[PDB]
Write a protein that binds this ligand. Structure first.
Ligand SMILES: Cc1[nH]c(-c2csc(N=C(N)N)n2)c2c1C(=O)CCC2
Length: 126
């Protein structure tokens, strides 16, 4: 069994910015979700080999996780906040796509997503 390469966190020719919205995404949004008691299954890419989930990357073709997002934010990978918000939403959606309704992982994603929504509701103006 094999995992795919992880999503990139560095791309020197991709234009980048540091903006107040991106700073909020790191200092408020990421930090709030990262410390949560349910964050630990989303802090790195899904290891389909160790978890014995050979169908994970058959179904999930746009993987995303908070470890990747954290590195992207710390590395100033993004141009704008929408790119990062999209990454969080990809992470949550993948969980709902792969898993069964009511599974523990889905309840964990829902708890994190609730906080995500509350924080991005107050994304500062640029
Ligand atoms: C998003 C996600 N994370 C995990 C998981 C289990 S154990 C672990 N440990 C880490 N990452 N330290 N992550 C799963 C999952 C799914 O969607 C399907 C089932 C398993």
């Amino acid at each position: 069994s094999m995992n795919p390469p992880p999503p990139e966190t560095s791309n020197p020719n991709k234009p980048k910015r540091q903006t107040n919205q991106l700073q909020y995404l790191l200092r408020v949004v990421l930090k709030t979700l990262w410390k949560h008691q349910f964050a630990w299954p989303f802090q790195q890419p899904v290891d389909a080999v160790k978890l014995n989930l050979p169908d994970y990357y058959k179904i999930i073709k746009t993987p995303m996780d908070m470890g990747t997002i954290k590195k992207r934010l710390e590395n100033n990978y993004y141009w704008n906040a929408q790119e990062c918000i999209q990454d969080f939403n990809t992470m949550f959606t993948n969980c709902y796509i792969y898993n069964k309704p009511g599974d523990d992982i889905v309840l964990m994603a829902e708890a994190l997503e609730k906080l995500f929504l509350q924080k991005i509701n107050e994304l500062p103006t640029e």
